[PDB]
């Protein structure tokens, strides 16, 4: 199964530019992004999905800014990116679930918000 360079939490303030939640698969073997599916879950909801087969992303309305850098996906990088509005509205535990061919794995990151 897929393996992750794990990270317990990340922290942002309103001085951040964009909020980035890291997700890194070490043992990535895919050759085309069609072989990969990326799902980001927050409090049960799928708040971001990338369907590599259909080259198609999906975010709900309150996460209108969420995205991953598909150009980086084959290096093992499924890191979620969003703006400050969406991030401060949704602080808590995020799940990064990656599917590659017949393998899958997930990892958890906590998004922390610090007031200066």
């Amino acid at each position, epitope marked *: 199964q897929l393996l992750f360079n794990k990270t317990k939490s990340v922290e942002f303030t309103f001085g951040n530019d964009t909020v980035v939640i890291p997700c890194f698969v070490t043992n990535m073997e895919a050759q085309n992004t*069609t072989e990969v599916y990326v799902k980001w879950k927050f409090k049960g909801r799928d708040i971001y999905t990338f369907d590599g*087969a*259909l080259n198609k992303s999906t975010v709900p309305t309150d996460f209108s800014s969420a995205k991953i850098e598909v150009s980086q996906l084959l290096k093992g990088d499924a890191s979620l990116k969003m703006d400050k509005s969406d991030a401060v509205s949704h602080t808590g535990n995020y799940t990064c679930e990656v599917t590659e061919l*017949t*393998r899958e794995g997930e990892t958890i990151i906590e998004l922390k918000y610090r007031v200066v």
Partner: antibody, heavy 124, light 108 residues
Framework: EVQLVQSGAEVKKPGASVKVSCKAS????????MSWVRQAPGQRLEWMGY????????KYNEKFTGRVTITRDTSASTAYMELSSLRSEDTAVYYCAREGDFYANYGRLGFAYWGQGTLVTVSS | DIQMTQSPSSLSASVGDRVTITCRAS??????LNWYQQKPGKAPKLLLYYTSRLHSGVPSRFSGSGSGTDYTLTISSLQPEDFATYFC?????????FGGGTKVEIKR
């Protein structure tokens, strides 16, 4: 080239069991789910189930539970479908199938590679 | 289970004709519909996945469209090697189910 080569046609007495094999070649056997679909002569195709050769997970159609058994031999690059308690209505061509170069979608995005078919006739 | 119904059952048309066949599902399947081509005594061949995506190799005269429960396959300029039965398959929910098939024959 991807290639799915199945075992020969067989006749089985009603009540007996059959085991169709499917040898994959031209790609990494564990990288893709192997599905099984059957087609009775003159009828439409019907999904039977799949196996993930990586984690050995399987799913069956409710119609065949208790009778169907999908297995794989990773070193042999071979999936197997075994149907038991055969009825004269199990007479069909049985196919193994495989998806395109995708993540494991189990046929939601279509079966892109098919075996040539194994005709199983159930008769006394 | 999701029931698939195709129309027409069989069909005849000249070389070059535009041919259109419809697949209908007993409930929304969210564009998770696939089209197959099968010649007698042969295994099926994937033509389109996800309503409108050409499988690699399939000539461009094949095309699909639809949403919800109603989908169509269209051959723009019918060719002799298009003689076959065409099947739809819903990929929405298990168990996956197939239409009853449309036979396409050539008038010459």
């Amino acid at each position: 080239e991807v290639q799915l080569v199945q075992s020969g046609a067989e006749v089985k007495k009603p009540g007996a069991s059959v085991k169709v094999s499917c040898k994959a070649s031209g790609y990494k056997f564990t990288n893709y789910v192997m599905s099984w679909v059957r087609q009775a002569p003159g009828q439409r195709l019907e999904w039977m189930g799949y196996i993930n050769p990586y984690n050995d997970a399987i799913k069956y159609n409710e119609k065949f539970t208790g009778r169907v058994t999908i297995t794989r031999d990773t070193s042999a690059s071979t999936a197997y479908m075994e149907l038991s308690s055969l009825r004269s209505e199990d007479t069909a061509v049985y196919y193994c199938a495989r998806e395109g170069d995708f993540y494991a979608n189990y046929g939601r995005l279509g079966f892109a590679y098919w075996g040539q078919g194994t005709l199983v006739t159930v008769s006394s | 289970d999701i029931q698939m119904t195709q129309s027409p059952s069989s069909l005849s048309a000249s070389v070059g004709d535009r041919v259109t066949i419809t697949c209908r599902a007993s409930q929304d399947i969210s564009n998770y519909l696939n089209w197959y081509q099968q010649k007698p005594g042969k295994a099926p061949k994937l033509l389109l996945y996800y309503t409108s995506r050409l499988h690699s190799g399939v000539p461009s005269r094949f095309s699909g469209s639809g949403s919800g429960t109603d989908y169509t396959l269209t051959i723009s300029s019918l060719q002799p090697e298009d003689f076959a039965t065409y099947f739809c398959q819903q990929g929405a929910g298990f168990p996956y189910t197939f239409g009853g098939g449309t036979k396409v024959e050539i008038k010459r």
